[PDB]
């Protein structure tokens, strides 16, 4: 069971669009909060692409999390200096020991497959180095070959990931995304990887449609690609 975010004429417009899709056991609607609950064995990426809909958190306590993924090192190839945010993970518990990850990447310099992992510790004082060991490796890559709306020589990607873990087990750990540098040579830091990460944080899971990140001010400093 998952919850998705979307008047009275709007309602049947959507239920319509979904009907020929199998694996769906039921559909429930709350137009007040502008959400929709769907209990199924069917992929959420199926539900969303058919439709604009985002994965949202249920009301269940300690079921939703977020990780704002930022670069820690200064990279020669990375000239985006207005923000260090490169990615966003939205996490929802969708099972008893099942969890789903809405990952967006935007503004990375090198196209490529980026690899997501969860590290043991939520200590980002020293970037990846201080997060300790890999705790969960995600086999599926984030395919970042789409050009980014943030200009040329910048790339974006998106994917849903999954893990046999409850949300409460991820709280306080580090979510880390990285790729081997194409040119480790040009990087003085003796750094071999391009990494961005964030502490996995408790979240109410009431996210809006656009996947964005604001400064302490409130100004929007980053968003998922269109």
């Amino acid at each position: 069971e998952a919850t998705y975010a979307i008047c009275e004429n709007c309602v049947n417009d959507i239920k319509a669009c979904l009907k020929n899709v199998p694996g769906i056991n039921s559909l429930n609607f709350d137009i007040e909060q502008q959400i929709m609950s769907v209990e199924s064995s069917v992929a959420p990426s199926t539900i969303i692409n058919t439709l604009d809909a985002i994965i949202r958190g249920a009301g269940k306590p300690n079921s939703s999390a977020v990780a704002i993924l930022e670069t820690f090192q200064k990279y020669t190839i990375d000239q985006k200096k207005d923000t260090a945010v490169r990615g966003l993970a939205r996490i929802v518990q969708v099972g008893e020991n099942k969890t789903l990850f809405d990952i967006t990447v935007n503004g990375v310099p090198e196209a490529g497959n980026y690899h997501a992992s969860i590290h043991e510790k939520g200590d980002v004082s020293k970037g990846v180095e201080s997060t300790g060991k890999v705790w969960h490796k995600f086999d599926e890559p984030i395919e970042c070959f789409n050009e980014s709306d943030l200009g040329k020589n910048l790339y974006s990607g998106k994917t849903f990931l999954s893990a046999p873990l409850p949300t409460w087990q991820l709280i306080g750990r580090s979510f880390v995304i990285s790729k081997s540098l194409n040119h480790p040579e040009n990087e003085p830091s003796s750094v071999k990887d391009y990494s961005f990460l964030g502490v996995i944080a408790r979240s109410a899971g009431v996210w809006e449609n656009n996947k964005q990140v604001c400064a302490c001010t409130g100004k929007t400093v980053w968003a998922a690609a269109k």
């Binding site: 999390a65 939520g122 200590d123 980002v124 004082s125 502490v199 408790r202 302490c216």
Partner: protein, 153 residues
């Protein structure tokens, strides 16, 4: 869960690292570290309900308050779990934080891991202000810096 850490940063000069340590699951939490780039004086210092910093104040929620209390100073009988009072910045703009707290915890219903730690521009009035907002947030003004409390060990 015995050690936690937080990297405080913001849009300005204020930045810092705060450590948490709790030997016994129901022992006190030791809280220490440093915050620099502050103006001289007292600054509100507390933990929010969530650690979601995608939408600022909105996504992080009110003060961490599982017991549904009103806002207070840390020594007060009536206080949110997240209420850590004030940190003090010296003349060089540095607040050296050294706290023992009995209400926050690194486990159980009062567990603060995965929540936002925040330091504010103005002093927390410790709920002793003469308005309703005092009993909700302590009137500490705007957020200078924040971070998510993560597992350190």
């Amino acid at each position: 869960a015995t050690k936690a850490v937080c990297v405080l940063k913001g849009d300005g000069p204020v930045q810092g690292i705060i450590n948490f340590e709790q030997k016994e699951s129901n022992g006190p939490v030791k809280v220490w570290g440093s915050i620099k780039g502050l103006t001289e004086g007292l600054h509100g210092f507390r933990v929010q309900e969530f650690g979601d910093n995608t939408a600022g104040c909105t996504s992080a929620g009110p003060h961490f308050n599982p017991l549904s209390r009103k806002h207070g100073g840390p020594k007060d009988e009536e206080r949110h779990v997240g209420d850590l009072g004030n940190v003090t910045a010296d003349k060089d703009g540095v607040a050296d934080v050294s706290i023992e707290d009995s209400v926050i915890s690194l486990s159980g219903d009062h567990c603060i891991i995965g929540r936002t730690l925040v330091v504010h521009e103005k002093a927390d009035d410790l709920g002793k202000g003469g308005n309703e907002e005092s009993t909700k947030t302590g009137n500490a003004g705007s957020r200078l810096a924040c971070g998510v409390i993560g597992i350190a060990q």
